[PDB]
């Protein structure tokens, strides 16, 4: 076999002129085991395909002629690798990947299989290995490498047309694969969008009854749901406002024009599978994503979504939010009043007197414990319904954890109260303190205070932690030095000296708080060094760093606030606690009224008005009444 591989590798047909003679004399064919690499299954056709110059290699035609003469072409052309790293790759894949139209045409003409799946480890999705995923099919391979002519040929050839709705081992179709290769750069977004559009038009022309975009992969995701969950901002933006001005396929659009006067026109957005789909909607996918998605905070700025969220807020959610805020304020006022008037006798529980104040006090206590139980079960319901991971409990969901911890302090206080312990007071005040700081949760619902609260969060998580690590190291070091110098004093302990040196930070430091030492100069030098390092350097540096940080988080803070309000809107819409279900957005309007068959479309559209003072063109309206 080495002579054949050498001849095809060098592209020298003169070495194989006697091939068919001795093959016929020996009664052998090129697809027998003796002409294949035992380790990989590589054959002479594949070697000829891999090596060529300027798209030309003449040995391939010779091999095809010899194979046709010996037995047949079906077993020779459709040879493939048999290892576990290039499994299923054949000559058609190589022809497409090499960007050679002629070889693809010749391979298809001689009976190549246009549904062969190349499912080796190289061609699958993985992190710690090289590879390139394209959906395993030659149609997906041609689509994902920006070769429009080859997909047109593969779909429209007479010898074997390709199956446009084929699915790989994961279940991805061509459109799933096109979503998968996007990476939110400019040129990639441009070509991915163009190829998506062309495949939709061709699929509509060839199969008018086929709905490609409804096909789901093994995870149950359509291409739009996959684009939303993976954070593909460009593909989502393209899909949600898609407009196709072409007869016989206008029903594929998702943005329509309803009417137009001179400068003013009205557009309709499709809104199907955005807020109601009963499988996995776009808003649920974006809002409840797992914090590792790249463009999590930016995806809600795509055009229809921001407006429909503002519409939901203005229509019915705002009043419910204000009602919840009012009820929480009443709860905290009652809790404060009940805790303020606690009795000061020993050993609870305390016997009630037949007097008015005791009745009001015990009623307040009952209401406080009731609210604690309520927030406890709300926390459990959150954890079960969302099923967050270990990472998500720390990098996300701060408010849920804070409200849950408040309820835990309340319940431990109840347990200690009925166990005859005065330490229940130690629990209660902590709950009370947390109860007031959680009032800042309601700053969302107002734009300026919500953005301000997001900025407070980012200051705590970025600047304060870095400050406090270095500060605590310096404080502990100088405290140990100073307490070691002191001998037989009042202070002479780590806690007292730590407190005394902490007092310098708040503008209350003494510099002469003790004299129980020998070596005054050592004491003064240590205190002056501490004061210079922490007070004059580090605090002013914290101010400077916060000033740097606040300049950079404006737009990010606004986007995070909008995501917070979106989560609030979705939770209120889901729960609603009054049996009401008036949660549809806009009218059930007729868009075109001409599907491919005689029926007419109604599609739950959302209306937006626009004004333009240039490009006085005529639009294809739906109605003549403005």
Ligand X SMILES: CCCCCCCCCCCCC(=O)O[C@@H](COC(=O)CCC)COP(=O)(O)O[C@H]1[C@H](O)[C@@H](O)[C@@H](O)[C@@H](O)[C@@H]1O
Report whether 529 contacts 481 (CB < 8 A): no
- Residues found in the chain: 626
Q: Smallest distance from the beta carbon of 607 to a second copy, in angstroms?
A: 6
269 pairs with which residues across the strands? Answer: 255, 606
Query: In whole angstroms, what is the distance from residue 338 CA to residue 431 CA?
Result: 13
Position among 124, 242, 251, 378 found at the interface with a second copy (CB under 8 A): 251
Neighbour-count burial for 541-550, b at 16+ CB within 10 Å, e otherwise = ebeeebeeee
Position among 280, 564, 568, 572 found at the interface with ligand X (CB under 6 A): 564
Does position 619 interact with a second copy (CB under 8 A)? The reply is: yes
Nearest to 174 by CA among 159, 192, 161: 192
Does position 571 interact with ligand X (CB under 6 A)? The reply is: no
* Residue 578 in marked binding region: no
Tell me the C-alpha to C-alpha distance, in Å, between residue 25 and each of 66, 416, 586: 13, 99, 79
First to last CA, the chain: 78
Query: In whole angstroms, what is the distance from residue 371 CA to residue 334 CA?
Result: 11
259 pairs with which residues across the strands? Answer: 266
Query: In whole angstroms, what is the distance from residue 139 CA to residue 286 CA?
Result: 30
Does position 21 interact with a second copy (CB under 8 A)? The reply is: no
Question: Which letter does DSSP use for residue 259 in this model?
Answer: E
Nearer Cβ to a second copy, position 210 or 337?
337
Question: CA angle at residue 155 from 150 to 159, to 5 degrees?
Answer: 100
Does position 389 interact with ligand X (CB under 6 A)? The reply is: no
User: Could you tell me which stretch among 21-29, 67-75, 160-168, 609-617 binds a second copy (CB under 8 A)?
Assistant: 609-617
Residue by residue, what is the 3-state secondary structure of 41-104? CCCHHHHHHHCCECCECCHHHHHHHHHHHHCCCHHHHCCECCCCCCCCCEHHHHHHHCCCHHHH
Position among 170, 244, 408, 608 found at the interface with a second copy (CB under 8 A): 608
Query: In whole angstroms, what is the distance from residue 499 CA to residue 298 CA?
Result: 46
Does position 15 interact with ligand X (CB under 6 A)? The reply is: no
Position among 24, 291, 447, 555 found at the interface with ligand X (CB under 6 A): 291
239 dihedral zone (left: phi>0; alpha: psi -120 to 50; beta): alpha
Nearer Cβ to a second copy, position 200 or 553?
553
Q: How far is CA 588 from the centre of its chain?
A: 31
Considering only residues 224 through 253, tell me which ones interact with ligand X, judged by CB under 6 A: none
Torsions phi, psi of 168, nearest 5? -85, -170
Nearer Cβ to a second copy, position 136 or 312?
136
Nearer Cβ to a second copy, position 18 or 437?
437
Query: In whole angstroms, what is the distance from residue 488 CA to residue 465 CA?
Result: 36
Does position 545 interact with ligand X (CB under 6 A)? The reply is: no
Residues sharing a CB contact under 8 Å with residue 85, sequence separation 6 or more, in sequence order = 120, 121, 122
Does position 541 interact with a second copy (CB under 8 A)? The reply is: yes
* Residue 399 in marked binding region: yes
Site string for ligand 6IY, 492-511 (x = CB under 6 A): --xx--xx--x---------
* Residue 507 in marked binding region: yes
Q: Smallest distance from the beta carbon of 398 to ligand X, in angstroms?
A: 3
Q: Smallest distance from the beta carbon of 493 to ligand 6IY, in angstroms?
A: 6
User: Could you tell me which stretch among 136-144, 360-368, 394-402, 596-604 binds ligand X (CB under 6 A)?
Assistant: 394-402
Report whether 571 contacts 565 (CB < 8 A): no
Position among 27, 520, 578, 599 found at the interface with ligand 6IY (CB under 6 A): 520
Position among 223, 231, 304, 364 found at the interface with a second copy (CB under 8 A): 304
607 pairs with which residues across the strands? Answer: 268
Residue 479, Cβ density class (10 Å: 0-12 exposed, 13-18 middle, ≥19 buried)? buried
3-state DSSP call for residue 338?
Answer: helix
Nearer Cβ to a second copy, position 88 or 388?
88
Considering only residues 65 through 84, tell me which ones interact with ligand X, judged by CB under 6 A: none
Considering only residues 521 through 580, tell me which ones interact with ligand 6IY, judged by CB under 6 A: 521, 524-525, 528
The count of chain residues that interact with ligand 6IY, using the rule CB under 6 A, is 10
Position among 245, 315, 353, 490 found at the interface with a second copy (CB under 8 A): 245
Report whether 454 contacts 557 (CB < 8 A): yes
Query: In whole angstroms, what is the distance from residue 399 CA to residue 405 CA?
Result: 10
Q: What residue ranges bind Na ion (CB under 5 A)? A: 507
Does position 390 interact with ligand 6IY (CB under 6 A)? The reply is: no
Does position 529 interact with ligand X (CB under 6 A)? The reply is: yes
User: Could you tell me which stretch among 60-68, 105-113, 159-167, 390-398 binds a second copy (CB under 8 A)?
Assistant: 390-398
520 interface partner picked from a second copy, ligand 6IY, ligand X, none, CB below 5 to 8 A per type? ligand 6IY
Position among 328, 474, 491, 576 found at the interface with a second copy (CB under 8 A): 474
Q: Smallest distance from the beta carbon of 509 to Na ion, in angstroms?
A: 9
Does position 441 interact with ligand X (CB under 6 A)? The reply is: yes
Does position 235 interact with a second copy (CB under 8 A)? The reply is: no
Known binding site for ATP: residues? 2, 42, 47, 51, 86-89, 97-98
- Interface residues with ligand 6IY (CB under 6 A) are 494-495, 498-499, 502, 520-521, 524-525, 528
């Amino acid at each position: 076999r080495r002579s054949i591989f050498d001849a095809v590798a060098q592209s020298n047909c003169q070495e194989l002129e006697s091939l068919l003679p001795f093959l016929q004399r020996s009664k052998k064919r090129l697809t027998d085991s003796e002409f294949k690499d035992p380790e990989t299954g590589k054959t002479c056709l594949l070697k000829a395909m891999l090596n060529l110059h300027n798209g030309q290699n003449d040995t391939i035609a010779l091999l095809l002629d010899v194979a046709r003469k010996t037995d047949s072409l079906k077993q020779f052309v459709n040879a493939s690798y048999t290892d576990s790293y290039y499994k299923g790759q054949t000559a058609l894949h190589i022809a497409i990947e090499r960007r050679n139209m002629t070889l693809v045409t010749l391979l298809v003409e001689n009976g190549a299989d246009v549904q062969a799946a190349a499912n080796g480890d190289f061609f699958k999705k993985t992190k710690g290995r090289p590879g390139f995923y394209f959906g395993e099919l030659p149609l997906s391979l041609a689509a994902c490498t920006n070769q429009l002519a080859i997909v047109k040929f593969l779909l429209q050839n007479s010898w074997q047309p390709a199956d446009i709705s084929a699915r790989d081992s994961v279940g991805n179709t061509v459109l799933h694969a096109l979503v998968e290769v996007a990476d939110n750069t400019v040129d990639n977004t441009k070509f991915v969008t163009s190829m998506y559009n062309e495949i939709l038009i061709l699929g509509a022309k060839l199969h008018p009854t086929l709905k490609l975009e409804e096909i789901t992969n093994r995870k149950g995701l359509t291409p739009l749901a996959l684009a939303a969950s993976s954070g593909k901002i460009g593909v989502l933006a393209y899909i949600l406002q898609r407009e196709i001005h072409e007869p016989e396929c206008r029903h594929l659009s998702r943005k329509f024009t309803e009417w137009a006067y001179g400068p003013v026109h009205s557009s309709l957005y499709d809104l199907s599978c955005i807020d109601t789909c009963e499988k996995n909607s776009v808003l649920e996918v974006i809002a409840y994503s797992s914090s590792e998605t790249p463009n999590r905070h930016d995806m809600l700025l795509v055009e229809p979504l921001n407006r429909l969220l503002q519409d939901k807020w203005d229509r019915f959610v705002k009043r419910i939010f204000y009602f919840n805020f009012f009820v929480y304020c009443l709860y905290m006022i009652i809790f404060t009043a009940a805790a303020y008037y606690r009795p000061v006798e020993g050993l609870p529980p305390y016997k009630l007197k037949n007097t008015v104040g005791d009745y009001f006090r015990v009623t307040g206590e009952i209401l406080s414990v009731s609210g604690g139980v309520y927030f406890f079960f709300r926390g459990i319901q959150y954890f079960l319904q969302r099923r967050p991971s270990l990472k998500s409990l720390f990098v996300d969901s701060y408010s849920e954890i804070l409200f849950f911890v408040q309820s835990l302090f309340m319940l431990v206080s109840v347990v200690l109260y009925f166990s005859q312990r005065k330490e229940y007071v130690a629990s209660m005040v902590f709950s009370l303190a947390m109860g007031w700081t959680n009032m800042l949760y309601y700053t969302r619902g107002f734009q300026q205070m919500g953005i301000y609260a997001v900025m407070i969060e980012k200051m705590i998580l970025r600047d304060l932690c870095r400050f406090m690590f270095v500060y605590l190291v310096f404080l502990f070091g100088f405290s140990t030095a100073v307490v070691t110098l002191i001998e037989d004093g009042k202070y002479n302990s780590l806690y007292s000296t730590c407190l005394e040196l902490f007092k310098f930070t708040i503008g209350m430091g003494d510099l002469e708080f003790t004299e129980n030492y020998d070596f005054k100069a050592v004491f003064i030098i240590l205190l002056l060094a501490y004061v210079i390092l922490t007070y004059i350097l580090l605090l002013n540096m914290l101010i400077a760093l916060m000033g740097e940080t606040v300049n950079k988080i404006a737009q990010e803070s606004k986007n995070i606030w909008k995501l917070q309000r979106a989560i609030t809107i979705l939770d209120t819409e889901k729960s609603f606690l009054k049996c009401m279900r008036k949660a549809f957005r806009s009218g059930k309007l007729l868009q075109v009224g001409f599907t491919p068959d005689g029926k007419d479309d109604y599609r739950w559209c959302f209306r937006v008005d626009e004004v333009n003072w240039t490009t006085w063109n005529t639009n294809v309206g739906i109605i003549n009444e403005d």
